[PDB]
């Protein structure tokens, strides 16, 4: 294969002591070629802070980390090691159709460009290995000889100095072509209708709040299992559309990673040996590569089609007989396209495979012909079992949460994001790496507290235990590391700025769903669930187990005090 050689050369060539043909490859689907060479701490101060939740399995689970070559081969061949039927003809001229409108809808004020060195390093500086290499001239000029292969119509080092510059390179070229999705946002809501990127968590409950106020049938959220092992060839082809939007010079770099890296991907994996550790070399024409820059915009777009080829489904449009037709006319699909494509978009809410959608009514439920046979198989049900709506917004599941109205003591109302507590006081009480001090393991404590501070304020719980880890750890001291790779946190409370303030800032000032520009001065005036709510959700209150807590926690935040040591520190509680 001329298209995928050069890159199997170089691995080939440098890894050459240790180069062998396995016969006994367990990849079924993946092409094989060869093989070569022949985790996480728990957060003390968060753990001194939550006792109660020392008896919880959630959190016990959460705390186990097997990040491992031995944990690898269990997730690759589950549903990575197989392969997607083609989708019927009918259903391939509705999906392009559909692709083509979509993308011309997509791009109606924005136009495609190139992305650029100056972007990826503020987006690499802006968070060790990766910053050196942006900073070093040699690694830009690797990145300028792959282009000119690309530009050749040739790939060469897309998939250990070498290698982590051939990776960082390799991302570095996707972000080039296809970064401008999510630079210029393209799936922001205003542009995409259906998209939610650049919102922020703290807006999602309002734009599901939104779409339940728009007539039709239920809201449905259906999972797809292993999403990225369910793109097919064709949906690879219908995404690519995107680059007749292009100029010549960024068509041509965008055209390069499509057909060389998208639709002909080389990955390295491990795999179990009984002689030591081997990396193995696989190729493979479908599929998401799910490490690639694009995949989440692609994604969006795919799942944004699909649910409208479902919602046409639904409405009577497409029929078993149209999926199945080789000859099928575009005619009807144009027509409601063009006249009530918009209309249908904005019913949804759509984040990479990730959807809510309300449609005009219920028959959507059944409508399974077209997303089963586009690959798009739902998670855990019957394949020809309907889906399960629900009737109430705040009981949809969408980017791991749900939502709820909360009434506020002066008579206004806040739409909050939320997720069983266990979740948030799980996660909370993991470090990210070994050999953390604990200054840098309070920081994150502190990061984690003033997340729940403004995003998950209204749990009992969780407004207590933060009000326990700030009052335990330094006032002047600075929230470090990511509490949450979500790509819907913006990060709000990664800073020493008082937290009412901030809260004011989000659910008042700047909150385009709060009328009244009212401050709020207090933390007591700030609301909480209902206790029924907050107990259904998780809580502990009224267990006398957190009974005890609540009264003895002054002195768990003396102990961390006296541990950390002389510093300035403010009470919370
Ligand atoms: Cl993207
Ligand atoms: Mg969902
Ligand atoms: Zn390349
Ligand atoms: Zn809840």
Known sequence: ???????????????????????????????????????????????????????????????????????????????????????????????????????????????????????????????????????????????????????????????????????????????????????????????????????????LGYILRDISKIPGGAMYADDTAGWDTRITEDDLHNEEKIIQQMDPEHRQLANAIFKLTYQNKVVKVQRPTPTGTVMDIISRKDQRGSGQVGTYGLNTFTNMEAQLVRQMEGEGVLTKADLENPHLLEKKITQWLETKGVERLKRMAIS???????????????????????????????????????????????????????????????????????????????????????????????????????????????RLASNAICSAVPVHWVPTSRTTWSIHAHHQWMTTEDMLTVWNRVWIEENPWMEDKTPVTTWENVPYLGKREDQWCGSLIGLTSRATWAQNIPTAIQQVRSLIGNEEFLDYM
């Not at 980017?399 to 506020?408: G, K």
């Open 1 to 203: 294969m001329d298209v995928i050689g050069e890159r199997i050369k170089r691995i080939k060539e440098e890894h050459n002591s240790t180069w062998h043909y396995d016969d006994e490859n367990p990849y079924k689907t993946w092409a094989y070629h060869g093989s070569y060479e022949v985790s996480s701490m728990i957060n003390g101060v968060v753990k001194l802070l939550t006792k109660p939740w020392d008896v919880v399995p959630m959190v016990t689970q959460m705390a186990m980390t097997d990040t491992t070559p031995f944990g690898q081969q269990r997730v690759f061949k589950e549903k990575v090691d197989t392969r997607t039927p083609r989708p019927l003809p009918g259903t391939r001229k509705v999906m392009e159709i559909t692709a083509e409108w979509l993308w011309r809808t997509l791009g109606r004020n924005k136009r495609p460009r190139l992305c650029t060195r100056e972007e990826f390093t503020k987006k690499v500086r802006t968070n060790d290995s990766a910053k050196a290499a942006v900073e070093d001239e040699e690694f830009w000029k690797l990145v300028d000889r792959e282009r000119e292969l690309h530009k050749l119509g040739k790939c060469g080092s897309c998939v250990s100095r070498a290698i982590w510059y051939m990776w960082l390179g390799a991302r570095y070229l996707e972000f080039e072509a296809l970064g401008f999705l999510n630079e210029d946002h393209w799936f922001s809501r205003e542009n995409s209708y259906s998209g939610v990127e650049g919102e922020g968590l703290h807006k």
């Open 352 to 462: 990479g495979d990730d959807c809510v959608v309300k449609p005009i009514d219920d028959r959507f439920a059944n409508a399974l012909l077209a997303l089963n046979d586009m690959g798009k198989v739902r998670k855990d049900i019957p394949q020809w079992q309907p889906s399960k709506g629900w009737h109430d917004w705040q009981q949809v599941p969408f980017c791991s949460h749900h939502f709820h109205e909360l009434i506020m003591k002066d008579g206004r109302k806040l739409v909050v994001p939320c997720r069983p507590q266990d979740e948030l006081i799980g996660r909370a009480r993991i470090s990210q790496g070994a050999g953390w001090s604990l200054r840098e393991t309070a920081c994150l404590g502190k990061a984690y507290a003033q997340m729940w501070s403004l995003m998950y304020f209204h749990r009992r719980d969780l």
